């Protein structure tokens, strides 16, 4: 992985590939979706707190729109699997929460959405198409929340 | 570069671009998103158990070459060798040359015999995502089962 | 607040918001317009006829939890109690706490035993309009029939 | 019910719930349609006379558009069931006519379409959606008649 | 004005507007373009072969009153007479009054008995174009066949 | 029939009803189509000559568009059945040619498309809808031919 | 101009415009892109094996004249001759006059008897592209098989 | 054939008919497609070299769009069948390559796309409709390549 810190990757770029453990210790690889599904990557700072409890709840509340024959959704944070597992159980999250745990924030850094001062990923979101190219990219600033409707719009255009 | 340690189901299939018997370039990546791909490695043109094996593939080709899939046979022989053999044998599917570097793709898939300098009889089915979904490498004397290949491909469709 | 005078078919199902075993808030109104809801009141976790009853619900869960319906089990126990029991029992459906105020929702549905401080074994199916369509409260000794629940739900669909 | 007299409720408001007897003595409750059908409420002044014989005839003449899998229609007036029953039989009305009889005009008052001087409901109409919210509201002044076409337009937009 | 010379199949059905038992106005033209119409003339309410005939229509009404057709019974009696008889008999289909002028519509259809001042037992099916497609007027003693009416209507649909 | 001579009836008018013999001596009545089909009436001057051999050939050449479940086409002229029969056989016309023969030109006069000086119908065309009302009307002046495409456009709008 | 050397399957069918029994002009090209065309050449109206042959075509006409195909009978006789024969025989399909120039179309198709001045009994099916798809010319004494014509036409459709 | 040299035939003209041998020695006739398919004619200068290896590869790469129930595609050049056969085998071309070999360039001359100085066809393309009329015509100048997308657009409009 080539660290970018917080210089967010924008549309047109090859999405950095990765292999991370989900909350149930299963390995998930980004390139495995190529040629099959568009992938929504939802980076978040920390389990149990802040604006992302609301943002992942948005993902949860409209999950059929993000996990279906054409699309997949993966949430990514620096926490380890035990942490994500407990949080997901208390939150009703059934989608994958991946651990960008050790090396710490390496994937977040590669996408340019890592807060080097706090050691947590910023609230960045990407849609990766079937060719492995980024087709939607955003990084919400503190004080503003993301909108799952924009995520579904972006995904709909890669099936339309 | 794995020699004879066959790649396992779930692994990403190594990419390759090789010349077929008509000197056309065939690239595995080219099928991604479109067809499942059957890869049939074989040791040597004109000899061995593989003549019977490729004859069975030939005898059932439409089942392996359609809108849902493609079949590629790979060996260390150069195009002129595969062209002559394909013409005499009635083979119309691509026979690819893992010729120079010698056995490089066979080695990447872990189906190369380092002592003899030829590919072992290994077979893989790669899905539309480029992932290995079926893998086998029968030992000396035992022939591969073409019906098993067709069943694995049928599983990756409908 | 009806004590043990069970609400009848046709009545509007009293609204409620209760914590499930994972401390998530579950509100009946949340299903309005979307799913029919099976409400299974039970007296006490870890004991009684209800272990057999909830085991039968568990054993047939996909038939009660789908795009057309949901099943909620309600008792006066707090979340920690229901969490332990659900984990040991293999229950993945919501077990809700009518804990404090004690038995308030059970009382609203008229299935509360005021002498013992526990819900009687009453069952209701609430339709997409929030209306009670099926109601029952079997007497001591007699177990409820899970097949009857599935039939009532099937009636409210297709 | 919180009486409003004739200050008609407009779109966006929760429609006051009610339980009234129809011409055949059956109880009809507004909240019973929530989560299932959009409801057209047609208030009218008096059975046997005036502009409403024409207005209910419009409802009758296009009934399939108002009573179907997505919509329900309820006419409401201060008359008692015996009166509505006779009128409906002589008029060919098969839809429900509800009695806002005693307390007199209480429901009409709650929707703000009650003529306090004459003791009859004004010619007010509402469409209540599946969430119980008013999505169409009108009150025709004497000298003008209502148009069932506007009622069907309003209903069509809550299925579209 | 044809007295007893029954109109024949192919003729345009004479228009009429008559009061039913509830004093509502029923006009034949109103069905044009929408439904086929069965016209059942009968002599006198409360007596004769027609009680059995209208009872059979009643007993099979949904087959005559649907999106494709309507059934109207016509006689010289006024609304109050038809209202009482319909209520006692369980008739919910329209009974129309060819009362004043007396027997005018029965005469136009050629099914009027000028000596007795009553309609004969004639039956017609009028199509969506207002054309008579079936016609009959059974003689004294012989009852009409309701199955024959349903068959004629079925012919004018699918 | 109320004669109008050549003051052509225009759209909105009730089409004068009629009963005329076709080339095979069968009676055809205009009102028989009401409530079932829209009817194209093609008046023409004389069998065997002039602009109408071309105009009826247009009708013939696109007949499926004029004789189907929604539409019917009737050509009308002052000639008797024997004349129309022979002409239709030599022309391949299978649609009805009706005789406005005796009284001479009475139907043509009623529609206002009769040439009183020559005793023949002018080249007038009408579309009669299912209610018996004229929805298209034209009368082509000598020197110009009619266009079957306009006839099909008019008919299409009464099914659309 | 081929005399009696019958055109073979695969050849382009020669174009023609000939008068039918009602003096209407019939052109082969007119069917291109729309219908397959059966061409039945025959020697002489009122005599020979062809009366039986055209009677069989008549007896099965709807199978040859529909949205997918048309049947045309061709001979050297003029319209008045074919009109009388068609009327007596009940023929409603077009009988075309290859009258003047005499036998010109029969000659173009290679089915003309130069010694007798009449067409031989040749039959062709022309497809929507104007290509001959079926061809035959039975010898004296042997009658043509109408079932064979219908089968050839069915092949050019569905 | 009436030679035009390089005065390219344009849309509206009858396409000169022809009968030529394909790479497998089979005769292909243009008029055989009339009343059945629209035909794409792709003229090219010389097998084994230049801009046309790329242009025929475009045809090959999107063949289903050019060879189907509504369309046919024929490539034409002055080379003889043995030459086209070898080239097609090395190129994966399964569509017909026709020989405008002897008389040399006669068909190319008839369509006005023959380079009289070099003795080879220019890179001309035509779409012939079901009536035998040219509906698309182009002749690309050296330095520019053709675009199969324009060919499919032209063909789509003759099925639309």
XYZ file of C-alpha atoms in Angstrom, chain G residues 12 29 32-33 128-129 131, chain H residues 31-36 131:
14
model
C -32.937 -15.374 -58.374
C -41.383 -7.983 -56.790
C -40.459 -9.091 -51.728
C -39.846 -8.491 -48.037
C -39.009 -12.984 -49.216
C -35.640 -12.173 -50.825
C -34.731 -16.362 -54.246
C -29.090 -8.991 -53.845
C -29.591 -12.202 -51.847
C -30.075 -10.108 -48.676
C -32.863 -7.930 -50.082
C -36.121 -8.254 -48.200
C -34.280 -9.851 -45.261
C -34.722 -2.438 -50.675
